[PDB]
Write an enzyme that holds these catalytic residues in place. Structure first.
Site, PDB file in Angstrom:
ATOM      1  N   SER A   1       0.771  -1.233   0.000  1.00 35.64           N
ATOM      2  CA  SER A   1       0.000   0.000   0.000  1.00 35.64           C
ATOM      3  C   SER A   1       0.806   1.290   0.000  1.00 35.64           C
ATOM      4  O   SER A   1       0.213   2.350  -0.154  1.00 35.64           O
ATOM      5  CB  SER A   1      -0.986   0.047   1.176  1.00 35.64           C
TER       6      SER A   1
ATOM      7  N   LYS B   1      -0.096   3.574  -2.830  1.00 39.89           N
ATOM      8  CA  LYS B   1      -1.280   4.424  -2.819  1.00 39.89           C
ATOM      9  C   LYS B   1      -0.898   5.897  -2.914  1.00 39.89           C
ATOM     10  O   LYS B   1      -1.644   6.703  -3.465  1.00 39.89           O
ATOM     11  CB  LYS B   1      -2.148   4.127  -1.604  1.00 39.89           C
TER      12      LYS B   1
END
Length: 260
Positions: A42, A45
């Site tokens: 992540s 992101k």
């Protein structure tokens, strides 16, 4: 000694540690496996949200554009998007959710808006990042299989790009400030880089975790009396179901920000 300390930390950890710290006082660096690829998980992101911020520089209506959230958009970890099923979220709200809560639905809406993972790669390239690649949506971008090049970057590339994004030339001022606000308001990073730093230092970060016990954090750090530091701590392990190890990221952060 810092190199010795990082080597020792890795030796005990049961995994592979990647660190890049950029000290913006003098552009000096502390590097450990900083040119090796790791699955971003992540931490990617940030790049998707930043790509939308870039678009917003030339479209004053973009950040308030409505995006419909449907039950079928929910994937494995979407604490904010699930609250908005049958309603809309703005692109700004999706950026906030993706960054501050690591919402996977939010990430996927940003990617879809941009036109797919390859558009996030193209954005990174536009910033001079030759290393970043986004290949998949969430959650499959978290498989983090050793040696798989998909959805990877290096600690140094990500540190350089995070610096450019948050402190440097990548984004227009309002957009840069928005990114910084988002990162500072992250809720998921208490036990990671932040836990290795003086408690009163201001920090923005984005975590990421995945399979192979892949445990990552990327941060911008503002000491009270010194120029900012940009720090990437990536960590991954040989076995698929390894536990994640935020403690190692905190330990690495403490090592490299010491004497300061």
């Amino acid at each position: 000694s810092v190199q010795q300390q990082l080597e020792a930390l890795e030796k005990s950890s049961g995994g592979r540690l990647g660190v890049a710290l950029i000290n913006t006082a003098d552009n000096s660096q502390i590097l450990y496996r900083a040119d090796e690829r790791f699955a971003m998980c992540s931490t990617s992101k940030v790049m998707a949200a930043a790509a939308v911020l870039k678009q917003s520089e030339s479209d004053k209506h973009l950040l308030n554009q409505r995006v419909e959230i449907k039950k079928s958009d929910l994937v494995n970890y979407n604490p904010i998007a699930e609250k908005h099923v049958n309603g809309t979220m703005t692109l700004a709200e999706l950026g906030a959710a993706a960054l501050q809560y690591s919402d996977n639905t939010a990430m996927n809406k940003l990617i879809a808006h941009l036109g797919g993972p390859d558009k996030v790669t193209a954005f990174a390239r536009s910033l001079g990042d030759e290393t970043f690649r986004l290949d998949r949506t969430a959650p499959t971008l978290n498989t983090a299989i050793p040696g798989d090049p998909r959805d990877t970057t290096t600690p140094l590339a990500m540190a350089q790009t995070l610096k450019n994004l948050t402190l440097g030339k990548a984004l227009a001022e309002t957009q840069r400030a928005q990114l910084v606000t988002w990162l500072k308001g992250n809720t998921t990073g208490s036990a990671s880089i932040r836990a290795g730093l003086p408690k009163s230092w201001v920090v923005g970060d984005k975590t990421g975790s995945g399979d192979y016990g892949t445990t990552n954090d990327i941060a911008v750090i503002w000491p009270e009396n010194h120029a900012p530091l940009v720090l990437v701590t990536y960590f991954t392990q040989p076995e698929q179901k390894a536990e994640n190890r935020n403690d190692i990221l905190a330990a690495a952060a403490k090592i490299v920000t010491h004497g300061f």
